[PDB]
Design a protein that fits this description.
about 0% helix; 5 strands; about 30% strand; binds the ligand Cc1ccc2c(c1)sc(-c1ccc(N(C)C)cc1)[n+]2C; homodecamer; Alpha-synuclein (chains A, B, C, D, E, F, G, H, I, J); mainly beta; protein fibril; complex; amyloid fibril; elongated
């Protein structure tokens, strides 16, 4: 076989899960957050996949 | 076989999971956060995958 | 076979898990955080994969 | 076979797990944090994979 | 076979686990932290893979 | 002060939370269940407070 | 002071939390369950407070 | 002071938490379960407080 | 002071935590279980407080 | 002072923690279990407080 990509690719066979991202956010997984009190200014309480590039 | 990529690629066969990211965040995995009190200014309480590049 | 990459690639066969990242965050694994009280200003309480490049 | 990379590559066969990172954070492994009280200003309580390059 | 890399590569065959990092953090291993009280300003309580290059 | 109870009592002052139960079930706390597939005959998947006295 | 109980009592002062149970179940605490697949016949997957007295 | 109990009592002053149980189950504490696959017939996967008296 | 109990009592002053149990299960503490695969028939995977009196 | 008990009592003053049990299970302490694969029929993987009296 032959393949040429510029990116971003994701090429496969017999594949149970696939995610391609440029951005941005993708949530595909099981996630449970239980929480009782959030205070403070300002605290990232429960972050799973996170990116902060403030300018 | 033959392959030429510029990146970012992810090329495979018979593959159960795949993630390609440029960014950005991707959450595909099981995650449980149980939490009772968050205070303080400002404290990253529970971070799993995290990136902070403030300017 | 033949392959030429610029990066970042991830090339394989018969492969159960794959992650490619430029960024950024990717969470694909099982993670359990149980927590009772977070205080202080400001304390990284429970960080699993973490990157802080403040300028 | 033949291969030329610029990096960062990860090239393989018959491979159970793969991670490629430039960044950034990737969490793919089992992780359990149980915690009862976090105080102080500011103390990295429980860090698994961590990078701090404040300027 | 023939291979020329610029780095950082990781080239292999028949390989159970692979990690390539430039950064940054990668957590792929089993990790259990149980903890009861963290105080002080500021004490790295339980660090597994850690890098601090504050300027 | 003086108090005589037969039970079940719960007597207090300055008290943030109170539960009295004879039965029966009482749910007053924060609870998050995230779930993707339940099979089998018959499996208690995620039980928090549970009592089974089949005769 | 004077007190006579038959049980079950719970007598106090200045008390943040109180639970009295005869039964039965009481859930007052923070709880997070994240789960991806449950199979088998029949397996108690994730039990927190549990009592099984089948006859 | 004077006190006579038959049981089960729980008598106190200045007390942050109290639980009285006859039964039965009481869950008042922080609890996080993250889980990816449960199989087998039949396996107690993750049990925190547990009692099995089958007859 | 004077006290006569039949049991089970728990009598105190200035006391941060109290548990009285006859049964039965009580979970009041911080608990984190992270888990990736449970198999076998039948294996107690992760048990914290456990009692099995099958007849 | 004077005290007469039948048992099981737990009598005290100025006491930070108290547990009384007849049973049964009580979990009040910090506990972290991280786990990747459990197999076999049937193996107690990670047991903290455990009692097995099968008949
Ligand atoms: C500000 C900012 C942030 C990210 C960023 C850029 C600018 S430009 C860029 C990029 C995306 C894709 C590619 N190829 C497919 C070769 C090369 C570079 N990124 C990832
Ligand atoms: C501000 C901003 C943020 C992201 C960003 C850009 C600008 S421009 C860009 C990009 C998208 C796709 C591609 N290819 C398909 C080669 C190359 C670069 N990104 C991902
Ligand atoms: C500000 C910023 C941050 C990140 C960043 C850039 C600029 S530009 C860049 C990059 C992305 C992809 C590639 N190749 C596919 C060769 C080469 C470089 N990154 C990762
Ligand atoms: C949104 C937001 C706001 C503030 C903020 C963050 C996110 S994250 C962070 C911080 C992280 C680590 C540290 N040390 C390891 C000393 C100190 C401060 N702050 C201060
Ligand atoms: C779209 C597409 C399809 C296939 C494909 C690509 C892109 S890129 C690639 C490849 C790249 C490098 C290598 N080696 C360095 C051995 C081997 C294969 N394939 C096989
Ligand atoms: C500010 C900043 C931070 C990171 C950074 C850059 C700039 S530029 C860069 C880079 C990305 C990909 C490649 N190749 C694929 C050869 C070479 C360099 N990184 C990783
Ligand atoms: C089948 C069954 C189950 C529970 C059960 C009974 C019968 S009878 C009983 C009981 C309740 C309250 C009291 N007092 C206030 C002294 C004494 C006993 N329980 C708790
Ligand atoms: C089948 C069954 C199960 C539990 C059970 C009984 C019967 S009877 C009983 C009981 C309840 C309260 C008291 N006092 C207040 C002295 C004494 C005994 N329990 C706890
Ligand atoms: C079948 C079964 C199981 C438990 C059980 C009984 C019967 S009867 C009993 C009991 C409860 C409370 C008291 N006092 C307050 C003196 C004495 C005994 N338990 C704990
Ligand atoms: C609801 C339910 C059904 C079956 C069941 C349980 C719960 S719990 C259990 C069991 C527990 C331990 C053991 N060994 C330590 C050998 C063997 C079997 N089974 C078989
Ligand atoms: C309803 C009620 C109110 C008060 C009360 C009881 C019941 S029971 C009790 C007590 C029992 C035993 C003891 N000692 C063995 C020293 C001391 C005090 N008080 C003080
Ligand atoms: C089958 C079974 C199992 C446990 C069990 C009994 C029967 S009877 C009993 C008991 C409970 C409380 C007391 N006192 C307060 C003196 C004395 C005995 N237990 C603990």
């Amino acid at each position: 076989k032959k393949g040429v990509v510029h990116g971003v690719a994701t090429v496969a066979e017999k594949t149970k899960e696939q995610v391609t991202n440029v951005g941005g956010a993708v949530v595909t997984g099981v996630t449970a957050v239980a929480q009782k009190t959030v205070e403070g200014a300002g605290s990232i309480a429960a972050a799973t996949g996170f990116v902060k590039k403030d300018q």
